[PDB]
Amino acid sequence: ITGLVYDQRMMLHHNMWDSHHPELPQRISRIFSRHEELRLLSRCHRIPARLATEEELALCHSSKHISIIKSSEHMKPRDLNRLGDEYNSIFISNESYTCALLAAGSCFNSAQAILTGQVRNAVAIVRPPGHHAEKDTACGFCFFNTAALTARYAQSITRESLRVLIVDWDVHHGNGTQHIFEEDDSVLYISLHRYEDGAFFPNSEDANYDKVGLGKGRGYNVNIPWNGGKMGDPEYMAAFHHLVMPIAREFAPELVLVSAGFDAARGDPLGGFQVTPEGYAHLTHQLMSLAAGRVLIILEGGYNLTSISESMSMCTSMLLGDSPPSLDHLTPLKTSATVSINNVLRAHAPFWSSLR
């Protein structure tokens, strides 16, 4: 069976100055609603949300960071505004901390359900997102790094060296996730992201292909950066075919986490890409051949309400065992994307024998 967690309480996090800010509360209600419409919801086993504990947060975050974000809970508006503006792209309301605890806790429960064999796989319709969050700071709509925390939680209830793969197909680089695991050979981080030579958020050259990890983590950080063109299904299918999947098989994860942002989607106001729902279905389907089907799909970004609802529903459909929808005829990829994939191929060929 396929697990699903959703809690409307996570809608409580909101922007009291700009109510039309793209990271909307209804991002999660709309995705959930689409699951009802497509009658996918009843096919799933509902997994309860819970609060992450401060101890669980400490798995990836410093006492300082946890403490300050926690304090925002009892802050007055003007102090909330001040505190948020101290970060890169953050808004805060009195409910933000709790919502971020719920987001992470929901994912812990889902990973637990997967690892105990209660479900085979699962989707987590959560917010605020997580993958920009660093050990010591909030960033890009994220407070705590949900997927990173779920990885450590997973290892904490199995064995410390449980091989976790994190595929991050949110259109932005997960800077927080890369950094948290940069010296780690037990968590393989693979991100596809619009890069534009560092001009695309989060504007750091950390996201380039030559950042392959440090220390015993060398080779266990894979950045696939897109430059120039409007990337869509063919570019992503080719990157999975040439890079993501063979690296994944060689790594042989025991658990796959998808930092599944849907802002690379056709229609997204931010991403500028054109991955279709069918595309996301095929990416999901391929990831399902890993870790004996143990896949947790975690909502990150994505800001066209219609696009993210259709896209994530299609993923859940794949996790339920539906056959992949047919892709549009795959155009020869944009020459820029070929150059990107070759750069990664050359950068990780020394660490992965499947790449040569």
Q: Which option in Zn ion, K ion, ligand FKS, none does residue 89 bind, with CB closer than 5 to 8 A by kind? A: ligand FKS
- Residue 92: half-sphere exposure toward Cβ, Cα within 13 Å: 28
Residue of 23, 95, 134, 168 interacting with K ion (CB under 5 A): 168
Is 195 near Br ion (CB under 5 A)?
A: no
How far, in Å, CA of 57 to CA of 355, rounded? 36
User: Which residue's CB is nearer to Br ion, number 57 or number 270?
Assistant: 270
Q: Could you count the other beta carbons within 10 Å of the beta carbon of residue 330?
A: 13
User: Could you give the C-alpha distances from 306 to 27, 30, 115, 309, in angstroms and in order?
Assistant: 9, 8, 32, 5
Q: Which of 14, 35, 131, 132 is catalytic?
A: 132
The structure tokens listed for 265 are 């989607």
Active site residue 132: yes
Any idea which residue has 């024998």 for tokens? 353
The structure tokens listed for 86 are 């101290």
User: Which residue's CB is nearer to Br ion, number 37 or number 328?
Assistant: 37
Residue of 15, 96, 145, 191 interacting with K ion (CB under 5 A): 191
Residue of 18, 19, 20, 42 interacting with Br ion (CB under 5 A): 42
Q: Which option in Br ion, ligand FKS, Zn ion, none does residue 39 bind, with CB closer than 5 to 8 A by kind? A: Br ion
Residue of 141, 181, 201, 280 interacting with Br ion (CB under 5 A): 201
Sequence-ordered list of residues with C-beta below 8 angstroms from that of 217, at least 6 positions apart, any chain: 181, 182, 183, 184, 185
Angle at which helices 305-319 and 277-287 cross, to 10° = 30
User: Could you give the C-alpha distances from 58 to 66, 144, 185, in angstroms and in order?
Assistant: 8, 10, 20
Which residue type occupies 198?
G
Residue whose CB is nearest to Zn ion in the complex, by number: 301
Residue of 147, 247, 258, 270 interacting with Br ion (CB under 5 A): 270
Binding site for ligand FKS (CB under 6 A): 89, 129, 131-132, 140-142, 170, 172, 201, 261, 263, 300-301
The 3-state DSSP class for residue 168 equals: strand
Tell me: is residue 14 an annotated ligand-binding position. no
Q: Which option in K ion, ligand FKS, Br ion, none does residue 220 bind, with CB closer than 5 to 8 A by kind? A: K ion
Sequence-ordered list of residues with C-beta below 8 angstroms from that of 149, at least 6 positions apart, any chain: 52, 56, 57, 59, 60, 61, 104, 107, 108, 130
Tell me: is residue 172 an annotated ligand-binding position. yes
Task: Output the smallest distance, CB 202 to ligand FKS, in A.
Answer: 8
User: Which residue's CB is nearer to Br ion, number 97 or number 201?
Assistant: 201
Tell me: is residue 268 an annotated ligand-binding position. no
Is 345 near Br ion (CB under 5 A)?
A: no
The structure tokens listed for 214 are 């440090």
Q: What residues make contact with K ion under the rule CB under 5 A?
A: 168, 170, 181, 184, 189, 191, 193, 217, 220-221
Q: Which residues bind Br ion (CB under 5 A)?
A: 36, 39, 41-42, 201, 270
Annotated binding residues, written as ranges, equal 170, 172, 263
Binding residues for Zn(2+): 170, 172, 263
Residues with catalytic function: 132
